Amino acid sequence: WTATSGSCKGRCFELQEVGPPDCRCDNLCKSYSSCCHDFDELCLKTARGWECTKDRCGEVRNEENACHCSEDCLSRGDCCTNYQVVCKGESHWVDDDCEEIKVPECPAGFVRPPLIIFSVDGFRASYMKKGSKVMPNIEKLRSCGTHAPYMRPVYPTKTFPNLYTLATGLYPESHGIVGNSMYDPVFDASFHLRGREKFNHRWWGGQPLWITATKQGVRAGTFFWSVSIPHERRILTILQWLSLPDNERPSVYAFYSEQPDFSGHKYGPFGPEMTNPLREIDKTVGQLMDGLKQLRLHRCVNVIFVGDHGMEDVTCDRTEFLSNYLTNVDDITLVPGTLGRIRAKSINNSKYDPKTIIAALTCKKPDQHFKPYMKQHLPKRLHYANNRRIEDIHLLVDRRWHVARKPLDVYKKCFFQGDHGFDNKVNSMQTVFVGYGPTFKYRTKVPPFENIELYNVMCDLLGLKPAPNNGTHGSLNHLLRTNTFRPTMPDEVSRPNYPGIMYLQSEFDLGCTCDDKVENKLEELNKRLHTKGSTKERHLLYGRPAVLYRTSYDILYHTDFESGYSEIFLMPLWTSYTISKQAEVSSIPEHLTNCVRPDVRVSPGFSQNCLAYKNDKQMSYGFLFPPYLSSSPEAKYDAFLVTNMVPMYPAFKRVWAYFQRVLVKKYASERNGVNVISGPIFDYNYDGLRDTEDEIKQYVEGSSIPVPTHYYSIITSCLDFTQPADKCDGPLSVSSFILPHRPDNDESCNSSEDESKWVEELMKMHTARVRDIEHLTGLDFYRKTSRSYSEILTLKTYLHTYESE
Ligand SMILES: *[C@@H]1O[C@H](CO)[C@@H](O[C@@H]2O[C@H](CO)[C@@H](O[C@@H]3O[C@H](CO[C@H]4O[C@H](CO)[C@@H](O)[C@H](O[C@H]5O[C@H](CO)[C@@H](O)[C@H](O)[C@@H]5O[C@H]5O[C@H](CO)[C@@H](O)[C@H](O)[C@@H]5O)[C@@H]4O)[C@@H](O)[C@H](O[C@H]4O[C@H](CO)[C@@H](O)[C@H](O)[C@@H]4O[C@H]4O[C@H](CO)[C@@H](O)[C@H](O)[C@@H]4O)[C@@H]3O)[C@H](O)[C@H]2NC(C)=O)[C@H](O)[C@H]1NC(C)=O
Ligand SMILES: Cc1nnn(Cc2cc(C(F)(F)F)ccc2CCC(=O)N2CCC(S(=O)(=O)c3ccc(S(N)(=O)=O)cc3F)CC2)n1
Ligand SMILES: [Ca+2]
């Protein structure tokens, strides 16, 4: 109930939202059909348009007017944004040659520079280039401020998950808003774009920026706007609040535009009709900048211009239908469109089996424009599994395509020419970021970065402590003039043992054979030092990784590689080695094919054994340091140590071998040496975090050898490729992957062909940031470099996407 007979006199766009049944006057009141009778008259004034004209100068204040040209207006805060241009001989902000803003130039009474966040739905990153002639104010911001060529959204690339990620620094699995549509099985509640359930606070986790400020004594303007409040009014309100007294005036503000998203759905991202909506958005930016200039705040306030996702060409005729794959199509519910989520239509139906459904959806047509996944098998970079609102079955759809349940759904709900929601690495989904103001750099380009990082920077700009989040705080210090956050490296929890030779060959009862009994004081000392770490400086370029949990491990030195061996997990947590540009691949010799040698530094009881691999008909093994790349035939024996052995399904061995035997050498040629650090990952509960001993769901038949869910590699080299990896003076260059450790290759539709026609494509799909790998392993890399720690953090968050420019 709304007893809508209160008034809105003196309450227009109130910041404290009042309780039912008192009628409201806030910027969300319309949305909830709850405004006071008089809200349109008193708060949605439109008389005389939005611009002063010569005749209006010095007029008599008339309260019915939308915005004022009377003399008194500036103090009251309610001038038309163009008043001084028209009435007082001044220039538009856009026509002034831009000047460095070395310090905040604010009125007295201002305790910090305020932040204004100007967010625009569906503002594709290529619009900054392709629409620059029609967008002069945004063009000024970008070139005079700090800007990235693009900003990476989160998956799925939809409006709600992305705006709430910007607000929280959380992945959608962690903040709760995993779609524009959602079913929560715990509540038995659905969440939709239309309707009222999206207003319940039980959907919205984390701590968004506005609460973070409020909780820490910093006042926030309300971020949300009802769709019917025109843009010119939203701007006027923000300029009004900025004119408020020091103890009431908010320090943070948000503007939202529904364009260009709304039109690009109708006409496609580059439709000829899209020029006008870009013209309007720019003009809205110009009004704001002229307004701030009038209040002498244009060189005080930090402005952020950011989008939520981009936009792709998609039409009705490019729709895949589950009805052409499944006989049983009426027993499933599908969340459709540019992604696919499948659950049982009725949970009473016990015949429902996701495994059978995935099978019926797996490489059935030659050019299939979607791929089905158990959510735990989705690329770990999407971070889209750990939430009960994400259905066990997922369809990643090809860019440009839709999935629907049946034809009737597409022609009984062609209209749309553009859509979004695809994989967050697709170019057409990339969006924008510009920062402008005293706390941001001048005329600076920054590399591409993820929107999960912004929450922290917005806290840094307002002097707030961030709530815990998925940002890596300090990875974006290179955007800022000052207020940088200066983090320290996490302290190492477990320190490594360095075991020597303590065990005799005959103590080991492994079932492991090896034809190695092939016997001097030059070479006997030579290889002891190798076993003491004389080549570590060759293979451990950036320090050893710190283990940030409590565990028991040993550092093992060898000629060609170094490893940190886990006594709890009976295999390495990490293995480091350097291949130079000049290096050679050799075969495995025949005397060694199925050879495994005991490691005399590591007890039998902390070692794997070949008999378990023999007895496990499903499982086989591989090596982390590839025997293929050993330096010399004496050194190749070291690669066959039981402590370099890991469990590998045969299916995945085709992948591993291809990477180990072909790709590493290629990268070493292309990049002028590479450092490589590889290991296993265990994420049986798909939280993207390192599993403990007791979360491991699978061991090799009849042993304590745990089975990885994935395998990672971090490939590092010099950014200036003229210097080789082992001798690099400047910034570094990295690419990493987290490959799923799967018993078949159903994920790769060309997998019956030669590995050169599919493996490199699989790796690309499972590209990763070093920081993803850190969370999953409980390690911290790049501890000892000449580089600054903020530059290392930036490097750690980097993702190699394999998309063209
Ligand atoms: C991305 O960044 C985020 C932000 O930090 C990371 O997420 C965190 O991960 C932490 C570790 O997994 C997790 O810490 C846990 O907190 C539990 C209490 O949580 C409540 O309070 C916090 C703080 O205010 C709040 O933020 C939480 O909000 C979650 O839940 C609500 C549901 O109402 C959602 O609205 C909200 O979106 C959020 O959901 C998300 O997180 C939860 C996990 O907490 C997921 O389940 C959801 O799917 C979703 O992703 C909560 O309201 C606390 O219970 C945990 O402690 C258990 O385990 C420890 C082991 O050390 C043990 O000591 C405790 O006793 C306890 O176990 C007991 O309870 C168990 C269940 O009954 C039982 O199994 C045991 O036997 C015991 O009885 C734990 O400390 C933290 O909450 C989340 N935060 C968020 C916001 O998600 C995320 O990891 C980052 N991602 C990456 C890749 O790095
Ligand atoms: C979604 C979402 N998540 N966070 N935002 C705010 C936002 C953030 C950031 C930015 F960039 F800074 F983070 C910038 C800008 C915004 C404003 C977004 C906006 O104005 N709209 C239109 C109205 C819809 S709504 O009507 O569906 C709606 C949803 C939730 C809530 S609640 N329960 O949390 O109060 C009430 C509500 F009215 C949401 C999108 N929107
Ligand atoms: Ca885990």
Ligand SMILES: [K+]
């Ligand atoms: K086997």
Ligand code: NA
């Ligand atoms: Na296949």
Ligand SMILES: [Zn+2]
């Ligand atoms: Zn949209």
